[PDB]
Every structure is written in structure tokens, then in C-alpha cells.
């Protein structure tokens, strides 16, 4: 029923590929070699094939560097289609869940 929510009630197309990214040891700043790997390896692959990126949907850990990569790729590319980034996070660690 969660997938039926995504493809019917919200309405997203089906993935041709699903890559789920893990990590988070180096805390605040990642090396730019790996930032080039995220921006020009993974985000333009998910732009080309049509794909999902499952990461933590927070501003901490890996999802910070992922969201920097997706926003930076939307700067320097005109393909007229967004990159479907989907984020999961536990309800307890949410900052401002009171407004929901």
C-alpha cells in the first residue's frame, strides 16, 4: 500500500534502478573526490536512467552531501526533468514535527 501511495495517490513513475546510499563516518565535510563521485557519478546516472535515490532525509550525515550534489547538478544541466530523491527518517529525531 505504500508503493501504491507513491505510484497512484502522489503519482510517480516506476524506477528503472534503485540505489540506496549509506555511510556517515566523516561528519561535517566530505572529500571533494567523493563529492565529484556523487555529483557526476550518481546524480546524472539517476537523471539519465530514471531512478530513485534512497538516503536519510535529514540535513545530517550523508543526505547533506547528497542534497548538495542534487542541487549542484540541477545548476549545470538542462534535461527538463528532476532527480527523484526519496528520503526516510525516524519520527523521533525530527526537529519540527509539531507543525505536522
Amino acid at each position: 500500500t505504500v508503493y501504491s501511495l507513491v505510484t497512484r495517490s502522489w503519482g510517480f513513475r516506476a524506477p528503472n534502478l534503485v540505489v540506496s546510499v549509506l555511510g556517515g563516518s566523516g561528519g561535517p565535510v566530505l572529500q571533494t573526490w567523493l563529492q565529484d563521485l556523487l555529483r557526476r557519478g550518481l546524480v546524472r546516472a539517476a537523471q539519465s536512467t530514471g531512478a530513485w535515490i534512497v538516503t536519510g532525509g535529514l540535513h545530517t550525515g550523508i543526505g547533506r552531501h547528497v542534497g548538495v550534489a542534487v542541487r549542484d547538478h540541477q545548476t549545470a544541466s538542462t534535461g527538463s526533468s528532476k532527480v527523484v530523491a526519496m528520503g526516510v527518517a525516524p519520527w523521533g529525531v525530527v526537529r519540527n514535527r509539531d507543525m505536522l
Binding site: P28, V29, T32, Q35, T75
Partner: protein, 50 residues
């Protein structure tokens, strides 16, 4: 101030420096008082809120 994007884009936004917000906002005020459309587009593109 030198009106040279090709230095600032290619040496100061590679990702080595985690830039804070008011570091960008002061430079954007310098880019709005003078006439530099290219730096305005470059600084708004890095996730700033007006």
C-alpha cells in the same frame, strides 16, 4: 570586485570550504550595488534564501 567569475567559480566553490550564509549575503550586496549579473546568478544558485 574584479568582475572575474572564472576565478571564483573554479577555485572557491569546489566544496573545500563550507560557506556560511552571511559570507554569501555580504558578497551579494557587493554584487547588487555594483553591476554584475553573473555573480548574482552564481550566488543565488548556491541555496540562498531572500
Amino acid at each position: 570586485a574584479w568582475n572575474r567569475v572564472d576565478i571564483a567559480q573554479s577555485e572557491l566553490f569546489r566544496g573545500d570550504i563550507q560557506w556560511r550564509s552571511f559570507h554569501l549575503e555580504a558578497s551579494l550586496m557587493d554584487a547588487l550595488l555594483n553591476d554584475r549579473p553573473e555573480f548574482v546568478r552564481l550566488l543565488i544558485s548556491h541555496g540562498l534564501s531572500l
